[PDB]
């Protein structure tokens, strides 16, 4: 649905913002368009499986930022 795509687009923008906060990359050479396209082609599994992995990774990042470790 277009609402699912718009929520994922907003998540992508959130991750760009987090990248800008966390990076020390001093035209953002650390972000490679060819790596992003390859990853969009090759990430395995249906959307539900990818979402479960994304959620696990976000819970890990949240724990680092809240607890400090």
């Amino acid at each position: 649905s277009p609402d699912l795509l718009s929520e994922v687009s907003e998540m992508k923008q959130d991750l760009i913002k987090m990248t800008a906060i966390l990076t020390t990359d001093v035209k953002a050479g650390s972000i490679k368009v060819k790596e992003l396209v390859k990853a969009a082609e090759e990430e395995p599994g249906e959307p539900f499986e990818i979402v479960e992995r994304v959620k696990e990774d976000l819970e890990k990042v949240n724990e680092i930022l809240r607890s400090g470790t």
């Binding site: 699912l4 987090m18 906060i21 966390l22 539900f48 979402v51 959620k55 976000l58």
Partner: protein, 42 residues
């Protein structure tokens, strides 16, 4: 090129704010896609 410095507290709080938005969105996407999978299995 001298290393990585600590993140300031305000930048840490901003990153926490954003991860909150990401967790609410992913939780809703998870529920939607889980419902699709479970409605199909049922």
């Amino acid at each position: 090129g001298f290393g990585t410095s600590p993140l300031t507290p305000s930048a840490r709080i901003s990153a926490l704010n954003i991860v909150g938005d990401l967790l609410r969105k992913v939780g809703a996407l998870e529920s939607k896609l889980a419902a699709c999978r479970n409605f199909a299995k049922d």
